Amino acid sequence: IVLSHNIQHQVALPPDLDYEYIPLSEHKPPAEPARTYSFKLDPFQALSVASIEREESVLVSAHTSAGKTVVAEYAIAQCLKKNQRVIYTSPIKALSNQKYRDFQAEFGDVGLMTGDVTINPTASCLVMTTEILRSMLYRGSEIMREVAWVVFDEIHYMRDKIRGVVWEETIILLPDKVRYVFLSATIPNAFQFAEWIAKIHRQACHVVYTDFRPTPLQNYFFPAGGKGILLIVDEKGNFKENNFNQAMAMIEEKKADIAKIIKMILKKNFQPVIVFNFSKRECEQMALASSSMKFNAPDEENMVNKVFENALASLSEDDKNLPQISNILPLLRKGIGVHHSGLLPILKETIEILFQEGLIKVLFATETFSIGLNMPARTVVFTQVTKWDGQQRRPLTSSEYIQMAGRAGRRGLDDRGIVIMMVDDKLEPETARAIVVGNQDKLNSAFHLGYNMVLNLLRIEAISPEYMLERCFFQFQNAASVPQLERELISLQQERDAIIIPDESIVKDYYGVRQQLEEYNKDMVFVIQHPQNCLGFFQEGRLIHIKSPSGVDYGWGVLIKHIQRQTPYPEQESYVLDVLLKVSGDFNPKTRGEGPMPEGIMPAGKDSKNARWEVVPCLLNCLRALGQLRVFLPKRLESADEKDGVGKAVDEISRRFPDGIPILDPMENMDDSFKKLLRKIEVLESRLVANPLHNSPLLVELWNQYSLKMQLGEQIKEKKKAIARAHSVAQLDELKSRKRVLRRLGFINDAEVVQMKARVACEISSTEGHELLLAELLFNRFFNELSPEICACILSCFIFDEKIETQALKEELAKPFREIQAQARIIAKVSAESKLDVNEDEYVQSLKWQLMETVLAWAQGRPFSEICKMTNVYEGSLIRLFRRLEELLRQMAEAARVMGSEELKDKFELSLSKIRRDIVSFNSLYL
């Protein structure tokens, strides 16, 4: 077969094994297909659904807009037909809820489990996040026994530095009998992933890949302060080099541009447009520049006011009053939207809704909006292409470009998607070209050990940590990489052992000396050529010695004058001195030519004809000695016998002072410690002339060889390291260390049996969030006498890694914080004690205390407005922190329960009741 169009298929088979057997036919059909129609299937869908129908797992690799969700539906239907259960894991928050709404309306027998809520836990199809899958798995719930199929939507999130590990963990933990549908972006090494699944779960895994986009993209560049946009990638995906070149020239010649771009987009009916930025602040800034315009008809204005109010009706005439709403509404009314994680969740949803219904023509959003469900536009504008990964500025990866740009082009309603990238004031071509002809990044494991992990593996009879390491995807990519690396290492060793033909050990001395001279000579040029020490002595006729650009020697010359041109940026390189020198190789220039260094002028002399003596211009970076003498120069100094005549007076002075000519100390009086750090540089210059090598001609041959050997040695050491971190033992060191920690702290015995404290520590699941320390805290007490509302605030002290400002701490609050920071200190201690790369101070200091009072007063009954007034943290971030906090609290009630402190557990529940109220207890618009 049937349909055909740029579709690649592959299959993964388990490692032998593959020996017996079970053949006899087992080759189609074999079952009927549920919910085929309505629309005709695309061949890539047909293929993947065939894989699923045959009960074989399959990884689909296609762009997000390509319609991957249809395949998920089929597995659910098939599961529902066989009275089986299926699990839809979504990577993150809101979209799982949305997908739940879609599946609920479709299949009815559907439930939802997130951090915030639980729906229909007996349903045949459970939508849940990966993290909950991890917890429920470690807990070993019997539900998992009935599960036949797991669909992973957006599986490429396994490459996430903090959350990828969760994905991997739950994959490894599933029973081999289970089958998987992996939905992914067009990653390049899908096959490898399939193969890993095949090995570890002893079953086939198909891979369906295709380079298919329903609506094609055109990419345009806008240079900053430029006059328009340049098409740089056309519908056929052909790169137009020349326009890029023109654009960069448009930037070499070169706030408000965003407004002009939007106005242009408006004039040509390219709306709706998503304008991406990478900071909430930048988002609001951009909206301010935009806000002069108005994109809605009075009827549209009416429509959005009606929809908005219809959403707000559930709240109250006091919640309606937060200034984020009152002053966001005039923007919405003008047809301008904003979207970022700082807004209230209810605004994120209602703004999404107003965008989907076509009431918002321009939407300024941060990256996260790019992965929202079914919300594309006609045009996408990148406000920049630089993102901080930390103390570095990254040009956004191809995968990011794909993911964001995929929101352009609306399948039903648009002929094409228009993508306009505003460019940075400075940018090299190879990086941009790499992005726009984007090759997707590997799905490389980001596995790392965690305390909840290790503890849980140890806790269960039939499984072990060593197992997990052996079966890890990271390790699989290692066991793949290693033979290539040992082959590189061997090639390097051969080159090393083969280039060892320079002989001598005087070379080593030479290298050391040369580099020492370059550094010390740099010190000497520095400061001594600076006007602050050197300048004052600018009399006419004074004899000065010239440093020469690199290291040559034009000898002593009489200063003629000194000029300084300002437009010449280093301190030393600024003043220009005209000096008379005993020039020979002229040639270039004539009189005044140049410029950057005297150029063509060759020193000496002695072997001249043709000596000349002329006044040449040099800059102040070029200097060295200044000497202590001045001759009287004639006022009319432009004649053969007279320039050369001054020269005659110079040779006679030089003949009069052997072992001289004595020089001016430049630093003495506007000391001198530097001089004793100055004679040695000369000594080393004598060591150089002493070296037999200095004369031979090979020289540079032997030197470049020495360099190669030293480089190769460094590279080799590095390769042995890469091999070490390609070997399971690196991570195993981390493991043995963490085992030391667990013994020394008392969570498990030396016989590797989990204790009650380990068992309670198990039930705390947080991204990096110490999880240990809370357990220690409990058994150490430090919670016995706190009221619930106080306890809330203290627990709030662990989730916020964001910045807030401006408050003092009362003593009755500063002290418990201090005591916990003390516990953190003992823990980071034992951590260093056990060879962990933990930086003992950053751990201890990671528990930020500046938000204790906001949460405390919220827990004591303050209204939302007031606590929003007590900090600069964004409203949405605040509600997010509360939501993690509630989830955390449920976890703490659990661990208290599982250590029999019934009183603590009930207390935490009561705390939940204080926190879990009003807007913080808000249900989702989708549910």
Numbering used by the authors: 141 to 394, 425 to 737, 744 to 846, 850 to 1106
From the paper:
Like previously determined structures of Mtr4 from Saccharomyces cerevisiae, FRH contains a largely unstructured (169 amino acid) N-terminus and five structured domains: two RecA-like domains, a small winged helix domain, a helical “ratchet” or DSHCT domain, and an arch-like insertion domain that includes a KOW module. The domain is composed of two anti-parallel alpha helical coiled coil segments (arm and forearm) that terminate with a β-barrel fold (fist) containing a KOW module.
The newly determined FRHTrig structure retains the same general architecture as the previously determined FRHOrtho structures. In the FRHTrig structure, the RecA domains open slightly (12° rotation, 2.5 Å translation) with respect to each other as compared to the FRHOrtho structure. Furthermore, rearrangements in the ATP binding site in RecA1 result in a conformation that is consistent with productive nucleotide binding and hydrolysis as observed in nucleotide bound Mtr4 structures. (3) The most prominent difference between the two FRHTrig and FRHOtrho structures is the conformation of the arch domain. Rotations about multiple hinge points in the arch result in a 30 Å displacement and a 70° rotation of the KOW module with respect to the FRHOrtho small cell position. Hinge points are observed (1) at the base of the arch where it projects out from the winged helix domain, (2) at the junction between the arm and the forearm, and (3) at the junction between the forearm and the fist (containing the KOW module). Symmetry related regions along the elbow, forearm and fist/KOW of the arch domain interlock to stabilize the extended conformation of the arch domain, including the 70° rotation of the fist/KOW (as compared to the FRHOrtho structures). We conclude that FRH is a monomer in solution and the structural dimer observed in the FRHTrig crystal is likely a crystallization artifact, although we cannot rule out the possibility that such a conformation may be biologically relevant under some conditions not yet identified.
